[PDB]
């Protein structure tokens, strides 16, 4: 048996400026695996529990997001930079699991229009 892992990212609605909280930034489907703690989403910011998006205009405007999902209807989450935001460890749904990337907020506020990015590694420990 091969160990195949896939990810699909479906973009969410446009975000308009503070930005609103709990906004669906986009949806991730992880597939191919044979628990939530076996999956870890990491980024350069390395903020525990959140993925951080940074502006490309050199002003270092940031906002954070969480990654969360539902089990067979408790809130669950993979590790994000090494820690879980909500829920106990749970077995992932058979075949594939959806996770929702959802907005939190800006610690600094004062965002500006433009492009914000993040580069995210998804580690799966089969």
């Amino acid at each position: 048996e091969p160990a195949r892992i896939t990810l699909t990212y479906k973009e969410g609605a446009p975000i308009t400026i503070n930005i609103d909280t709990e906004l669906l930034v986009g949806t991730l489907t992880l597939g191919g695996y044979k628990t939530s703690t076996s999956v870890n989403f990491t980024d350069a910011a390395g903020d525990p529990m959140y993925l951080t998006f940074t502006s490309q205009d050199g002003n270092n405007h940031q906002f954070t997001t969480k990654v969360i999902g539902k089990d067979s209807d408790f809130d669950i989450s993979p590790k994000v930079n090494g820690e879980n935001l909500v829920g106990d460890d749970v077995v992932l749904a058979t075949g594939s699991q959806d996770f929702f990337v959802r907005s939190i907020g800006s610690k600094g506020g004062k965002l500006a229009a433009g492009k914000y990015t993040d580069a995210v590694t998804v580690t799966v420990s089969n």
Partner: protein, 185 residues
Amino acid sequence: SKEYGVTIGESRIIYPLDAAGVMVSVKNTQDYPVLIQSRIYDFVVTPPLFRLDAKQQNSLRIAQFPRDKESLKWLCVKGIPPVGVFVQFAINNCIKLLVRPNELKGTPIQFAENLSWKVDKLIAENPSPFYMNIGELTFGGKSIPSHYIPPKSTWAFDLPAGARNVSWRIINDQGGLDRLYSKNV
């Protein structure tokens, strides 16, 4: 939408202690090229980084401890691809690298049934020299987020109404599910 995928040709490697090496194929199943970045965690992996083109497969060499027990490492294989929001992902596919002495005489499934259970947490006891990589586990008919049980050791699980039946399947050397065992506690 954006797609990502990395496939490793096996879901575990059983590495005979002191053997010269093993080969593992890696596939870039996507339509763009990636750099493949391979690592061992707690051995060399050649090449540690190389370009793998769209739809292509290549091979990695894995090359070399306690002599009574298995040891465990992880091989991780990462594919790095080339208010508006733009996120890029990379998959880092990790599998068990189980270093197994020749002296050990058998495999995990021969000792799968020997797991004994206690509550003190639900504590599994493993008297075998192998890792018991459990793929499915229940107690009181309730699901328990699973984990491996280390050789000659124990592991403790958080409890999920008075029922005492534990059932488990280990994952075998071919990455298949092994037989269901069941015991009263």
